[PDB]
Amino acid sequence: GFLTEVGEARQGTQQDEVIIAVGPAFGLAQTVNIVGIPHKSILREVIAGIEEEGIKARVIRCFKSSDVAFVAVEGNRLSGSGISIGIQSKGTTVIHQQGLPPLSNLELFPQAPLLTLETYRQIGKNAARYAKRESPQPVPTLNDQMARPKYQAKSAILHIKETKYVVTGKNPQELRVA
Amino acid sequence: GFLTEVGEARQGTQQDEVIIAVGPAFGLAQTVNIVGIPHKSILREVIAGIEEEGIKARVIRCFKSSDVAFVAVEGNRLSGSGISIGIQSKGTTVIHQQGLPPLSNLELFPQAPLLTLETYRQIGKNAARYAKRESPQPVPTLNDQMARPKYQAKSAILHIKETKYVVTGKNPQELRVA
Amino acid sequence: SARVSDYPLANKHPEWVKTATNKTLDDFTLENVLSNKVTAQDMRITPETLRLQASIAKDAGRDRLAMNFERAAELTAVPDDRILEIYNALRPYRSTKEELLAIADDLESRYQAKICAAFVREAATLYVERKKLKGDD
Amino acid sequence: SARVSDYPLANKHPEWVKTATNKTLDDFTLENVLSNKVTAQDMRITPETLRLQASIAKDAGRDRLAMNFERAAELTAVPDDRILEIYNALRPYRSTKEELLAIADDLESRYQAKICAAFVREAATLYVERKKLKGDD
Amino acid sequence: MRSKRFEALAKRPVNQDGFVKEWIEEGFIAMESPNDPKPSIKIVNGAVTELDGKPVSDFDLIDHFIARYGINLNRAEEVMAMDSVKLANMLCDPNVKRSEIVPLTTAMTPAKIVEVVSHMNVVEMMMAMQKMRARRTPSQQAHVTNVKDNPVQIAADAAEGAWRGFDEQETTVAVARYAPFNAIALLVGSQVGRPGVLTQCSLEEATELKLGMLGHTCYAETISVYGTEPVFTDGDDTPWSKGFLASSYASRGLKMRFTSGSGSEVQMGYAEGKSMLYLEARCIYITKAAGVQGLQNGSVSCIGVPSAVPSGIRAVLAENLICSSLDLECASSNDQTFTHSDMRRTARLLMQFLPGTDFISSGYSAVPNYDNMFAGSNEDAEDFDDYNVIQRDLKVDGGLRPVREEDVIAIRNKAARALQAVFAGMGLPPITDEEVEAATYAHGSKDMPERNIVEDIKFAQEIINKNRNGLEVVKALAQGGFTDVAQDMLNIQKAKLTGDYLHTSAIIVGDGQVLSAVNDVNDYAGPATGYRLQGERWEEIKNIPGALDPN
Amino acid sequence: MRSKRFEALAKRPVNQDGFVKEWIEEGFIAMESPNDPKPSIKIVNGAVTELDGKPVSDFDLIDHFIARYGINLNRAEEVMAMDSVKLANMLCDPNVKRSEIVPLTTAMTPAKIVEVVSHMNVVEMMMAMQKMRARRTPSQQAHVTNVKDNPVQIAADAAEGAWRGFDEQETTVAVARYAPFNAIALLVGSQVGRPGVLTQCSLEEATELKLGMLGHTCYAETISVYGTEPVFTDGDDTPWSKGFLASSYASRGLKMRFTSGSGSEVQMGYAEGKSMLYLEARCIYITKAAGVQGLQNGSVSCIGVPSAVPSGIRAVLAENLICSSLDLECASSNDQTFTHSDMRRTARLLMQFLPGTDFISSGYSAVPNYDNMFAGSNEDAEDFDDYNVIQRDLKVDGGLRPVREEDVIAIRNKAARALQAVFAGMGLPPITDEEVEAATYAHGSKDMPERNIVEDIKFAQEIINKNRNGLEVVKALAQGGFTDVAQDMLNIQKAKLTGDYLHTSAIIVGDGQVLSAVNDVNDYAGPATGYRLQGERWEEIKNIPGALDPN
Ligand code: COY
Ligand code: COY
Ligand SMILES: [K+]
Ligand SMILES: [K+]
């Protein structure tokens, strides 16, 4: 237990933060990603990447959908900088931006097994740099033709389980991080 | 060239000579085996194998069938020892002996692409041991699951070609040296 | 009424296919592209062509394909950016009912797109029922 | 005569497979084997059984299979070594015509192998024509 | 102590694949689930009041769309009353004509046609598919992508793939902002390989339509539909937004198809307790109802989901058969990795390859899989020789052919040179002679010099924001020494004016001749009838490399 | 400059395979050769005077044998006058019963039935095969060999194969004088794995018959026939000597089949300018004429010959279909290496695996191929997991099942132990406990302690020399405390006494229950009819290793 819900998240007022938006079972019914990296460690590195760039990291838990684009959209709505990072329990990550359609993004990490703790920090760093209106070069592409063979069934099962915690119309919760 | 028919081959006298029975195209229309080892060199090591064991090595060209067993059989009739070695142009080889049905034998080498000049000499050797009624331990088994995939079609074409030199009812010819 | 015997139009009746702006197929030459005698705005399928194809589809036993072609014929009159606006309007949670009904009124009164107007009012009604309007997520 | 309805004999009519020795399937026990109550001949199939099976084959629409089984029933009377002799005699270039005819007369006269004798006699004249006798090679 | 037999087995690549015991309550079951609804329909005054269990009061948007537009209500009661086993028998009976079946299947409910094909084994389904396939002539579709979005490479790979026989080729992006370069590179390279090959660039829905509106694509395929309402919603569409989109493509004269595929709803968390095949049938009827001519299905990108459970690959063939049987073009997947095993992926591919479908694969990778930006295809460039050998072994037309290295080099080179001229003429970031040479001889992006993706993405962006259209590409080719290619580009643009290739299964072959189910009517009636590999095409397929003349 | 694409292609295993351009005049063509004879027949007073163009005055030994015994003369003119295209259609039509076709196909001349099946693509052939297969239930046969002729290993491997589901198992010798050992090893171990499993030891014809007389086998298969008279002659037989041999086996109560297979006559030098398929048809009719119940074919050991030429793998399925269309049991090969490619060898196997044959393979190697003494099979022990996965994927019963390491280990162990007892009671060169533990855990002979070839072979030759029979094995089993096995051994001989398993397709399952075409009647009539994988057998097939339970 390292995440506490501290009330309905409110809209940021200044271009000085990145929202990290996590799915409804993140750090709760699920506590590691598809390849066993602890949610605690993932959150730690993304927050450090953001802060590394002199930007605030603010964490929310999303309920209205478990889809990572919709998760990240909930967060971009509330982000002072318009920039958000959506993360599912299984680890799939997206950097999104107020103004973009739900299924468009700035950068996407669509093969969670390939992510490392070093990737997550790089992801936070890029998110902050977007926030600051720089044009960061994207995190280098990770791809592997055997990722779906090895992991897609497991990814489906973990997504089914997180999806059980979806709550239509429930606004995101701001989270305190231990 | 290297082979000279020196008339119809006559029945053997002494029980200590080994005949090498050669297919009707050996060293004529065909001069190398399925993998390139030349006929002369092959006769070379077979003979040497027999001789070094102290037995006479006689060679005849077989006509009434290009089948390696039947040509070995042709030779075992005339070998004074009753032991013969049948050899096809593509290289397939068999050690035969009087009293055995044609599709029985003392030793078979049914994957010619695996044979080497050293293998050919061991065969001559062993044939001689058998001619002395010595009971040689058999030439070590050669086998490769991909031999047929790589060479059976070529084996076929080579056999088709040698077979065009079969003469029904024609008696084996004796052959002279290199 | 076009039938499958009339297909392909390019081979069977190229004349029937004369564009947006009265250019013929044969007017689209490299030479005319290069002299700007013909441009992108000339290179547009017509509502007539699509309704002909709709008749051929029906004759081929594909009524829903034909209906698609009939809707497309109407939409040839709607500008590219307006097409994208209306498509996005139909996506979940984008629109209020009244906004969909107004897209529908506009389809009909500005573009005579009566089938597509009916299509959009149908979605509005069902979007209420299945809760896919703005605010329903 | 035996029919498809009679098959499998083991299940439907095991008492039909009583050996010529006149002891059933159930007699073939390890103990009996051990005590030499049953021995190597004891497990020789009988011509009676093969004729049973030949009829079922026929009933099953398989006349050539039945025929094979009839030859087989005849051949149960021929000793093992004699079987091999005759098989080898039928191989190419092994025999003279007269040698084959002697084999057939023998089958017929000593073993009453009528069908097999006709089979061999048949072989004998065709080996003449197609030159598969001793010395034809 | 361990068994050395089991230790060797444990190392086999197949044991790296994901397998799962069925999870019926969550729909993690390929087909024939006890929770799938019994087929039923009720109609009152011409409107459906019950569909496959559900009363109209409980219809979701998918039920409504299908009940109103997806089923021939005039014969639905008649057909529901027919015996599903006899209908399945009709499907594979060589003497029951395709045209006698389509009037029946298009009056079936989704549950009804699933019940029908579920009585069949895969041999029966293949027997049926060769007949029910809409286009008489089977075809093939390839992916042309690379992990760098290198446009020179895409043009060359595209020319080679067109030369090898693909009639449709598909690109997508590693970096989404590259998309207009990828699209243009694909189109140019495709017309160099074979004038007539159709091209698409698979993106977010609004973004892809806009690309098409600017004239840099020939068709669209990844126009996704889904078989449960919550999953469709997370796919950011409804049946009505997707039907509008379909009509929007056609209003711009662009060919399009939908995409679906078993297991999407499991993968996306809401199967509503139903089997993958039943939910995929709903997708197939959504497609029919929308008036879309064709469908990409056969699990497609979710293949790891049906393949994980029993009869998943049989289900995949079944969904393809339902698609064709409902008189839709079927682009039948075989385009996505699901296994580490060569044996296993071959069995999955033969289900469609042996009978023949409109597109045997909807994305054979014409690049080595490391460069495949749909995360790997079921076949890739390194399998080309194997593919041609199996065509030859079985006398099956798989849509492809053996080709000569020198032809491929000449064609890749010309594609690169044409694209080089395009970039120069349009003022895009140069393509150097060095890059033309590398693209000529490349196997994949590992063989290519790195490009300045900052410059490329900026100009690619400006194509979109300044609405630079397809005739700019035609002029630059014409002005840059590539009149033939420019004419071919213009011709494929002109195809957008006639509506002809908007029809079921249309491709464009020979000298700009449309080839669709309307003029290339499948007329199968058993042995020695229907499409047969023969004559010059058979000679072409026989001519593989390494076949020595015996004499 | 080299294309790196072609360099990558050049390295692929498939390009190590032997390919040849057709050579019509030497019959180096798989099927559909313009030299094949036009179907014809003339009958006078119930005797054939003309056969496929040839007058009886010109008949060779094969023509005489087929003309006098191989053809249903009662309907031969009837069927000759029927359209071959219609007949092909009837063959794959689910609504024309097998019992209505058999009277007609068995009345066809060899050229006629070849002409009929050549109108078919492989999907049609497969559709037909599933109906024409004589046994309703598909089965499987394995090779159980090793390059050492190590008897304790053979016993262990035999036991494991039986346990995995093979209903027939085949051994042979690296060194021929070892044969009696191999045979006894195979029998014992097979009975340990599953009582009722049938065993053979493949040798030269006179040698094999004698081992059967001695009771060390339960059937024979490699009783070769050839499709030209010169080749038959080099095979050292005629149709009459092979016919006599057939009846000799039956007269000793031993089930037997002949063996043939496309390409043998080419391989052996005399095709008489005919296609492999046409010469193979002659082989199948020789089998029919002889009254032999069944046939091993589908090129079998000559597979490198038809596989080298176009449509060779289709011809192999066609020869299997002709076999079953003639109402013969078909043990359909899939037992010999022809390719370095996994994709390719998988495509060749599925032709029989998908529809099912009496024996889907006639020698799946139940050892790794290094140990396979038929110079390699098309499948080996390392493919077992893939094979099970594909069964599950397609809902196809391929005759085998996933197994537990612990059970296999136990089973191989009791078999090694039992053979150990046997050598004991019989006073054969001892099998140490060392050897027993090694054969228990072996993958292959590389995992086995070397033995004294001299002491085994000496005792081996004496078993035949001194006519040591099966009873000796049985007693030794009983003496060493393997009464069960000894009983089970007695039960095989018992079957031999009843003759029931002499019939078409007979195997022995469950509690000594014969299962043949006579009491396991194939009744296919389309979807939902005929053999269907279901119930407990499907559950068994679904249970592959590594299936994770989702909840
Ligand atoms: C499987 C897959 C899917 C499927 C699962 C999606 C899901 N949400 O569950 C599928 C088919 C439904 C699907 C849909 C889409 C929709 C988005 C829907 C959504 N809500 O996510 C999409 C917008 C297409 C459309 N027409 O709308 C879409 C796109 C564009 C993409 C690309 C994103 C580009 C970008 N934004 O930068 C993409 C990189 C391909 C490409 N090169 O363009 C890819 C990620 C493209 C991927 C290629 C690639 N290079 O990675 C690929 C092929 C493999 C991913 C994988 O298996 N990873 C391994 C797995 C173990 O790791 P994982 O982290 O758990 O993976 C997750 C993420 O990839 C995520 N995810 C997948 N797509 C996607 C897109 C967005 C924007 C986001 C935020 C997250 C996305 O889903 C999986 C499972 O949870 C993939 N997809 Co989708 C490609 C669709 C191809 C054509 C349609 N199609 C194909 N099959 C079928 C079918 N059966 N039914 C219906 N339609 C289809 N996708 N995808 N997809
Ligand atoms: C292909 C093959 C054949 C085929 C071609 C033979 C030929 N003459 O052209 C085939 C099927 C017709 C055949 C027949 C026989 C007949 C003999 C016929 C004859 N005149 O050769 C045979 C007597 C069986 C019988 N029931 O009569 C025979 C046997 C017993 C054997 C064994 C010999 C043991 C020994 N004597 O010490 C053997 C070692 C298998 C084993 N493990 O027991 C093997 C050599 C057994 C081989 C297994 C092994 N361990 O090698 C195997 C499987 C592969 C050899 C190979 O491809 N090498 C690669 C090739 C490129 O190299 P190569 O040197 O050119 O190879 C040649 C030799 O092997 C030679 N040759 C092959 N067998 C053989 C036997 C003898 C005695 C001699 C002197 C030479 C023989 O032929 C090839 C080609 O020219 C093989 N055969 Co043959 C295997 C028979 C299996 C069951 C019947 N069968 C299977 N398929 C079909 C079919 N389509 N139609 C009809 N019958 C069959 N065989 N074979 N054969
Ligand atoms: K689906
Ligand atoms: K595709």
Ligand SMILES: [K+]
């Ligand atoms: K043959």
Ligand SMILES: [K+]
């Ligand atoms: K076999």
